[PDB]
Amino acid sequence: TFGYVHGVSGPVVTACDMAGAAMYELVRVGHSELVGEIIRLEGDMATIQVYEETSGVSVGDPVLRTGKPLSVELGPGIMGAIFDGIQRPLSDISSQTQSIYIPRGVNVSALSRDVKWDFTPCKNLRVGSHITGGDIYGIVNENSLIKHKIMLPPRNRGTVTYIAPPGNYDTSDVVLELEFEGIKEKFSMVQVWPVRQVRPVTEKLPANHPLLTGQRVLDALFPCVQGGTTAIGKTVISQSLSKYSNSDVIIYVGCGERGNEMSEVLRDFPELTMEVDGKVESIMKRTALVANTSNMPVAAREASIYTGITLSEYFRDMGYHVSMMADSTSRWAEALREISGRLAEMPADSGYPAYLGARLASFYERAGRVKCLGNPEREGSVSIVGAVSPPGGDFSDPVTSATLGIVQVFWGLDKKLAQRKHFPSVNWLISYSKYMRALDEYYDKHFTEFVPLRTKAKEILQEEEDLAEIVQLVGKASLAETDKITLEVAKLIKDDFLQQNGYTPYDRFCPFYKTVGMLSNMIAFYDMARRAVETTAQSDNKITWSIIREHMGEILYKLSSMKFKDPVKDGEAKIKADYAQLLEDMQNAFRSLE
Amino acid sequence: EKKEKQIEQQKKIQMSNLMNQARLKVLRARDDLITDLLNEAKQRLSKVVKDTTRYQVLLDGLVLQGLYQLLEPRMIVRCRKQDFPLVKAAVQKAIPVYKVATKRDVDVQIDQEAYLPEEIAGGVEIYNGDRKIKVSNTLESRLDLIAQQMMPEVRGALFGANANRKFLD
Amino acid sequence: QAAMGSQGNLSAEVEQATRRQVQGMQSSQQRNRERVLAQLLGMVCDVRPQVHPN
Amino acid sequence: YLSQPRLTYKTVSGVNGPLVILDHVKFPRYAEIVHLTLPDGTKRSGQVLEVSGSKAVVQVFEGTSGIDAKKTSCEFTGDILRTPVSEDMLGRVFNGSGKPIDRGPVVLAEDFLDIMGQPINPQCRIYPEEMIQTGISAIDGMNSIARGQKIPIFSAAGLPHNEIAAQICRQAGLVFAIVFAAMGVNMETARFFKSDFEENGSMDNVCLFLNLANDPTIERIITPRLALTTAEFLAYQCEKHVLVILTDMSSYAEALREVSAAREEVPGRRGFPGYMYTDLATIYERAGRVEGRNGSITQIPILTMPNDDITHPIPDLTGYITEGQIYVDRQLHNRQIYPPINVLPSLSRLMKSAIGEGMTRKDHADVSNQLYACYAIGKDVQAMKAVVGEEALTSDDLLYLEFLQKFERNFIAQGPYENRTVYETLDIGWQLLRIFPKEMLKRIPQSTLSEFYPR
């Protein structure tokens, strides 16, 4: 029931007199209730990994034992809240203490126990019916948007002997009491699930709906579907992906990033607005956060990825389409490197452990569209977005090549354009998306001419990477004029189409008609240029690429002006009314040449 | 017109050093007021050595405060030649207190071979058996402990509180 | 003569600024050097022995 | 209060490098402060790195030379390392341990703050949005700094990184205390920041912590902690604006690799310890604004990349904690450019929301994005000129080489006493963008080109 500190070294506390304590269960190290897990057992002792800085713990200090592993409180009151790695609400610590500091070993409920939520049961149930795990026994209007379907915890079943009437309840008032073989158990609105155990589900379905991002890269080139696992101002693309998704729940985490980058999140996220049926609403009515800066200790950083995926696994099981943004994945593996370095564990490659190919695997493979466990016919889905952060600009670090064997979509920055910002780039040697065949039924239905555009837009780019090595060696001399165009539309795509300034108001979200509209006008220009060379080639009036630049200098700026269209201040059919006029001036700019 | 600019720049240094030695004169003359405050408190603590009954219930705690810092089976007390009739009357009062506390046994004696200096002005210095660990609570180690932790309150009481320190008291 | 003369005459107000606040901070010392000395003698004579982690 | 008396030990059961391993210690506390007395009578102080039952491992600051097992006292204070802070330490010169070397008195404390830091809730922090006009056109017109940004000056050995920094302290202001911390610097650099702050007449606002090159090495672990604790006192309790200058943060990590070597942990990347990320994140993250307090800490550390490698573990782990960086390169230093600031790997992650309409000017964000793309292109044409020669270059690529001769002399190259405003920097930046015709500025929209280009 009780222990004593035998010795500390950083965040590694060795405690004596812990005979029957388990692995990965929590304790309370020290006089001031610092939480900490158990990562070893040596006869009578137990080596503790601590989630707070241990400066000031003496020997002989009490180590109180809990009977549970590391777990989160899943219930009503998650939407809008901001958590750390071990799920302490930073908005309830900023008011209960009235101070700007987080105390050491502070204890507060992760969900507020005083506020009253309205309860409305499922209407297909009665007093005396059989209930099983995952069965929804009540719906709570958490806010205007997200109904909060109270479900039974998995590994629980019985027969209903008491269910609460429709009224206002705080999260401790007992609603359900199921009868089992003998034992009866009384239930609440808050369930407790361990952050390293996967929440059970009946079936895992193939994913087929496109998850639409805001970037022109990975919407056109490397697409992602509702349930896929992607990876990638790596931190300015990451949170500009989370702020513009078409999901139901946004679960942003930050796994060890800069401090004033966490000040930018909690300033822009409440002030964002999202349209609903007539009204507009704030997006923090559907968005939970996990706030972990690099300032915070290294064990609590590692559990900030498990805290994010267990929140998004709970809201999947209601039937929603959540989307988890797992920012700074390589800072999470850096927490695993430092944690195992304190335990004298033999590192395999570059100081990283050997189980890094399993710990990153035990995260990404909780995604995917599922058929939810329980009777009222639900279908949920989690889409995981990573954010890889390779050290030193070298792409053979052991976090990338461990991720390549796990994820389904992957796009990474270039080799040359890593220290100098040209954002985004492509890196065709490892970039891929295996959902390119699984999105052809969608593409012919709604856009129906984009897939002929994409194969040519990948053909200009895959041919310029051949020619750029030879212009760096020959120098534009062994180039017939039909290839000096492909050097220049690929310069026009990688500067104007692919390159997206995500922190300007006119490009923080690029809708998919605008991406196809931007791609239609360039591939039309490539077909009108390469006919203006090839039809006047062997005889005189040889229209080269040089002649095209002098007379059409104002039109290639206007092709570089297609990204300055704001998709809100301008219309949807106003942008398309200004793209076709660029086509009718592009068609009238080669009739002057021929 | 370069020797002109050289003097004006050097005048900025001569202004800055006369303004710098102004501060350190004040801050030394503040640190002399504290030094004569502890010097005033030491001799007023040298009128607590007198009256022999207030000092008797001061060594009663000062001996037992050594016996709770180290919990050892053998300890020895090293005191002055003057008040050795008082430390013998102060050690024996602790043994009924120290033994019912902690449920331990003990053997405590007093050094007769190497006394404290007769300038220490009171206090006791409890060793253990092998003389390797030592607690030192004279009146001067008690003065130079509680004073160093009370320089926040001594500064606010003697020379007025800071005006621009808004938060945290 | 305006460089040497505007140093030493400024060095008069350097040494006149200090004596105004040296005499100020030692006039506030004598008011309550008995509020502190009733305190830091009372806490020296207030020994209280304990044993914190068993 | 600590009203118990302190246990003085004489049980030193092993010395090994910079460590002293005691034994028979009665309930030792982690991160404690001891006070060792050597046989000859001198005193060093140390800190506990590990307790295990009855034995402690003391990290002696001034090195363990002369410390034996027989007559070496170790008085355990029973407290973590607390520094004395006040407002009258603005104007003093302390050494790397916090002892004064201005021939003056000790600090009379207003409070006792724990030097290791106590972290701030991210929910109650203000985002740094108000821009600091630093004068220098390369770190203002393209890499702007806000009040509260942690931003290092990456440099190497020999480059004028201590003259670049002292220029910012003369020129910082909006569009103000200084807490300087010298770690392992030479005598001629500490002579330089002193004589610059003396001559400027701002010595009543500067608090210098000097750990010179012959000052002991393991004091450099606590020297940026002793300086930043003063800053977090002067900014959050005194409501002042603080500029913290941590020069040669490379000399932090070589004294941290030193203490982990003889401790024999698991070494990380290039022999540096495992916990180097969260240790520099302990230091760099003590910055920014908070809610309800009008003070701020703007951090400018200074590095030296060894062999000018930006992929060394000191600038690569610093670039993951701080918000942008300022790069000082060697190639522009040989070409007599001051300041030699390479804007291609430089960055300010707080520039995007600190500039714009209503803060500086309408066209700030568009000029810097175009001055980026012209310098990044004309450095590629210069490497294409080395292959095919000067003759095989088109007439719209004798413009990009025209830009580089006028970018690094009229915009970058400044002179150490120019206080160029944020409007004077931009008005330089448009006469460089009139080098090109209007139909090549492809990063600037039509709404700003119709107003700002033709003059």
Curated annotation (Swiss-Prot), chain A:
Positions carrying Phosphothreonine: 120
The record's account of how the chain is modified after translation: Phosphorylation at Ser-362 by AMPK down-regulates its enzyme activity.
Q: How is its activity regulated?
A: ATP hydrolysis occurs at the interface between the nucleotide-binding domains of subunits A and B. ATP hydrolysis triggers a conformational change in the subunits D and F, which induces a shift of subunit d. The c-ring is subsequently rotated and results in a continuous proton translocation across the membrane. The V-ATPase is inhibited by bafilomycin A.
What does the UniProt entry say about where the protein is found?
Cytoplasm; Cytoplasm, Cytosol; Cytoplasmic vesicle, Secretory vesicle; Cytoplasmic vesicle, Clathrin-coated vesicle membrane
One Gene Ontology term, aspect cellular component: vacuolar proton-transporting V-type ATPase, V1 domain
Q: Does the keyword Cytoplasm apply?
A: yes
Task: Tell me the CDD domains matching this sequence.
Answer: ATP-synt_V_A-type_alpha_C, ATP-synt_V_A-type_alpha_N, V_A-ATPase_A
Reactions catalysed:
ATP + H2O + 4 H(+)(in) = ADP + phosphate + 5 H(+)(out)
| A GO biological-process term | cellular response to increased oxygen levels
Do you know which InterPro entries this protein is assigned to? ATP-synt_VA_C (IPR055190), ATP-synth_a_Xtn (IPR031686), ATP_synth_asu-like_sf (IPR023366), ATPase_a/bsu_AS (IPR020003), ATPase_F1/V1/A1_a/bsu_N (IPR004100), ATPase_F1/V1/A1_a/bsu_N_sf (IPR036121), ATPase_F1/V1/A1_a/bsu_nucl-bd (IPR000194), ATPase_F1/V1_b/a_C (IPR024034)
Spell out which residues are annotated as carrying Phosphoserine: 362
PANTHER family membership: V-TYPE PROTON ATPASE CATALYTIC SUBUNIT A
Q: Which HAMAP family match?
A: ATP_synth_A_arch
Return the protein name.
V-type proton ATPase catalytic subunit A
Q: Which gene encodes it?
A: ATP6V1A
Curated annotation (Swiss-Prot), chain B:
Q: Does the keyword Acetylation apply?
A: yes
- Localisation per UniProt entry: Apical cell membrane; Cytoplasmic vesicle, Secretory vesicle, Synaptic vesicle membrane; Cytoplasmic vesicle, Clathrin-coated vesicle membrane
Which key words tag this protein in UniProt? Acetylation, Cell membrane, Cytoplasmic vesicle, Hydrogen ion transport, Ion transport, Membrane, Phosphoprotein, Synapse, Transport
Q: Which GO terms describe its biological process?
A: pH reduction; proton transmembrane transport
Its GO CC terms are: apical plasma membrane; clathrin-coated vesicle membrane; cytosol; endosome; synaptic vesicle membrane; vacuolar proton-transporting V-type ATPase, V1 domain
Per the entry, what this protein does is: Subunit of the V1 complex of vacuolar(H+)-ATPase (V-ATPase), a multisubunit enzyme composed of a peripheral complex (V1) that hydrolyzes ATP and a membrane integral complex (V0) that translocates protons. V-ATPase is responsible for acidifying and maintaining the pH of intracellular compartments and in some cell types, is targeted to the plasma membrane, where it is responsible for acidifying the extracellular environment.
Family according to the record:
Belongs to the V-ATPase E subunit family.
Q: What is this protein called?
A: V-type proton ATPase subunit E 1
From which source organism is this entry?
A: Bos taurus
- What is the taxonomic lineage of the source species? Eukaryota, Metazoa, Chordata, Craniata, Vertebrata
Gene this chain is encoded by: ATP6V1E1
Curated annotation (Swiss-Prot), chain C:
Chief place where the protein resides: other
Keywords in UniProt for this one?
Coiled coil, Cytoplasmic vesicle, Hydrogen ion transport, Ion transport, Membrane, Transport
Signal peptide start-end: none
Q: Where in the cell is it found?
A: Melanosome; Cytoplasmic vesicle, Clathrin-coated vesicle membrane
Care to name a GO molecular-function term for this sequence? ATP hydrolysis activity
Keyword Coiled coil among record annotations: yes
Keyword Transport on this protein? yes
What is any one GO biological process for this UniProt entry? Answer: proton transmembrane transport
Tissue specificity, per the record, is: Expressed in brain (at protein level).
User: Mind telling me which GO cellular component terms the entry cites?
Assistant: clathrin-coated vesicle membrane; melanosome; synaptic vesicle membrane; vacuolar proton-transporting V-type ATPase, V1 domain
* Domain of life of the native organism: Eukaryota
Q: How does it assemble?
A: V-ATPase is a heteromultimeric enzyme made up of two complexes: the ATP-hydrolytic V1 complex and the proton translocation V0 complex. The V1 complex consists of three catalytic AB heterodimers that form a heterohexamer, three peripheral stalks each consisting of EG heterodimers, one central rotor including subunits D and F, and the regulatory subunits C and H. The proton translocation complex V0 consists of the proton transport subunit a, a ring of proteolipid subunits c9c'', rotary subunit d, subunits e and f, and the accessory subunits ATP6AP1/Ac45 and ATP6AP2/PRR.
Q: What is this protein called?
A: V-type proton ATPase subunit G 2
- State which gene encodes it: ATP6V1G2
Curated annotation (Swiss-Prot), chain D:
Keywords for the protein's UniProt record, in alphabetical order: ATP-binding, Cell membrane, Cytoplasm, Cytoplasmic vesicle, Hydrogen ion transport, Ion transport, Membrane, Nucleotide-binding, Synapse, Transport
- Provide the primary localization: membrane
The record gives the membrane topology as: Peripheral membrane protein
Query: Any idea which positions bind ATP?
Result: 349
Lineage top rank: taxon: Eukaryota
Q: Which GO terms describe its biological process?
A: ATP metabolic process; pH reduction; proton transmembrane transport; vacuolar acidification
Its recorded name reads V-type proton ATPase subunit B, brain isoform
